[PDB]
Design a protein around this ligand. Structure first.
Ligand SMILES: O=C(Nc1cccc(-c2nnn[nH]2)c1)c1cc(-n2cccn2)cc(C(F)(F)F)c1
Ligand SMILES: O=C(Nc1cccc(-c2nnn[nH]2)c1)c1cc(-n2cccn2)cc(C(F)(F)F)c1
Length: 263
């Protein structure tokens, strides 16, 4: 069956020229609305949520882990290091690296999270441990953002990422204090006002993590607290046919608006 909401998302996708993937979970009734929900998309920086969460899980058995210093050397700097560049020849704690990765989308900070987990496969291993059989991280920053059509590396599906984001932020994949810390970090994101939240009522509260990369790939994953009802989880992934395509955060806002209108 195709619902009215799915038909509107297909019309938005058709006008956009690209490929749109959407997964909503409404935690009031556990119902799901999906558009291309089982197709693979490049995660780009939305993968930073999984890496931060994996470190949070490690911190459950090490009370001081988030205060552990990590050396930042000039050679560690990659292509977008707004926080880490200030600490070259110094250190940042794992909490500082997590906050920088999630809230500023710092790629050097992400690489330190990946390294703390033993490489991209350590992130994938954590995803499996929390029941996500779909997520895969294959590369470090910045190459995990190439976003080549048909390439399986560094991809997931909207359905899997929505289920994972729910378990991490509203369920029990993490301990109570770690879940609260992840929610606090997401709610303080600086990069998200033009993406999912631009399509939602202003009274709603959002925590999100954006991503972008090659092929005009433009992504956002969010936990949403509407006024007066149970939280929602929403994934919006978008990717385009030409390598140099421009980003389209407005398409993510439009997808979120259609979803909100259908509730
Ligand atoms: O910094 C970025 N992208 C980047 C960085 C370094 C190299 C290249 C590159 N390599 N080749 N071509 N461009 C690209 C970047 C982009 C976006 N964004 C643009 C449109 C929609 N979202 C948002 C953010 C932020 F959320 F973090 F603020 C960072
Ligand atoms: O690293 C990147 N982008 C980035 C960096 C930091 C934050 C964010 C972000 N966060 N939230 N939204 N965007 C995005 C990035 C981008 C591109 N590219 C090519 C055309 C358009 N883009 C290519 C590459 C790669 F060639 F190395 F693969 C990396």
């Amino acid at each position: 069956q195709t619902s009215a909401v799915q038909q509107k998302l297909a019309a938005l996708e058709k006008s956009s020229g690209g490929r749109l993937g959407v997964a909503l979970i409404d935690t009031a009734d556990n119902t799901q609305v999906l558009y291309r929900g089982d197709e693979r998309f490049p995660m780009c920086s939305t993968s930073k949520v999984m890496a931060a969460a994996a470190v949070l899980k490690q911190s459950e058995t090490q009370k001081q882990l988030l205060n552990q210093p990590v050396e930042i050397k000039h050679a560690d700097l990659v292509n977008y290091n707004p926080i880490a560049e200030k600490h070259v020849n110094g250190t940042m704690t794992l909490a500082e690296l997590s906050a920088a990765a999630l809230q500023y989308s710092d790629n050097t900070a992400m690489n330190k999270l990946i390294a703390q987990l033993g490489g991209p496969g350590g992130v994938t291993a954590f995803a499996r441990a929390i029941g996500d059989e779909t997520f895969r991280l294959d590369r470090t920053e910045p190459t995990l953002n190439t976003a080549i059509p048909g390439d399986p590396r560094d991809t997931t599906t909207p359905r899997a990422m929505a289920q994972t984001l729910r378990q991490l932020t509203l369920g029990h994949a993490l301990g109570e204090t770690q879940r609260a810390q992840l929610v606090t970090w997401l709610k303080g994101n600086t990069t998200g006002a033009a993406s999912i939240r631009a399509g939602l009522p202003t009274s709603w509260t959002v925590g999100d993590k954006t991503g972008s990369g090659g092929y005009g790939t433009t992504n956002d994953i969010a936990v949403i607290w509407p006024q007066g009802r149970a939280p929602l989880v929403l994934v919006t992934y978008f990717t385009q046919p030409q390598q140099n395509a421009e980003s389209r955060r407005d398409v993510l806002a439009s997808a979120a608006r259609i979803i909100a209108e259908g509730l």
